[PDB]
Amino acid sequence: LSLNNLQNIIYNPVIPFVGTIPDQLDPGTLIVIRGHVPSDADRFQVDLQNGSSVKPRADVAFHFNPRFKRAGCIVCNTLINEKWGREEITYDTPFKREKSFEIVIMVLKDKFQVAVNGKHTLLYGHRIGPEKIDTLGIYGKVNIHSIGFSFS
Numbered sequence: 001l002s003l004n005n006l007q008n009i010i011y012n013p014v015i016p017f018v019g020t021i022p023d024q025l026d027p028g029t030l031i032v033i034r035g036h037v038p039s040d041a042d043r044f045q046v047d048l049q050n051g052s053s054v055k056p057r058a059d060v061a062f063h064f065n066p067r068f069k070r071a072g073c074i075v076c077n078t079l080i081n082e083k084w085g086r087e088e089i090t091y092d093t094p095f096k097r098e099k100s101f102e103i104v105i106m107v108l109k110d111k112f113q114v115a116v117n118g119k120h121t122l123l124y125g126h127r128i129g130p131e132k133i134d135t136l137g138i139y140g141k142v143n144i145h146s147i148g149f150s151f152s
């Protein structure tokens, strides 16, 4: 965790991206993801993970998954011991092919609060303790300009 917090920003990561989060996600922590949905994207996802194991797959405390089929949606879920739980689906989605976005994930004591382009998008209640999250995963069809962290 750099003293100059601007030095913790990750620029132009290759997708698929996996990175260690530089400190624990305590209440008040922000994760800021700037990017662009490329032409013909089907879906992309941001995963807050407990480790980087590929097989068996690392637990995912928070799966945030924009999908571009038909009217579009966002699917949120949690992965434990390689099995998905019950999906929470948001149909009021701000994501579109060939549009830029800024995602802000705010870690609260009880939930994640997600805003896109400065507007509230969704809430996701913690299912796994957020103190187990150490890894950020970005997968699918997206271009990421930058990843930043604001720790309390």
Ligand SMILES: CO[C@@H]1O[C@H](CO)[C@H](O)[C@H](OC(=O)CC(=O)OCc2ccccc2)[C@H]1O
Pocket (backbone or CB within 6 Å): 045, 054, 057, 063, 065, 075, 076, 077, 084, 087, 139
């Ligand atoms: C019933 O459909 C499933 O809904 C789940 C959420 O409810 C996930 O969205 C899942 O996609 C995935 O399993 C996530 C994915 O695209 O995998 C990429 C990946 C990342 C890390 C390890 C292995 C695969 C999708 O197939």
Ligand SMILES: [Cl-]
Pocket (backbone or CB within 6 Å): 005, 006, 007, 008, 009, 147, 148, 149, 150
């Ligand atoms: Cl940062």
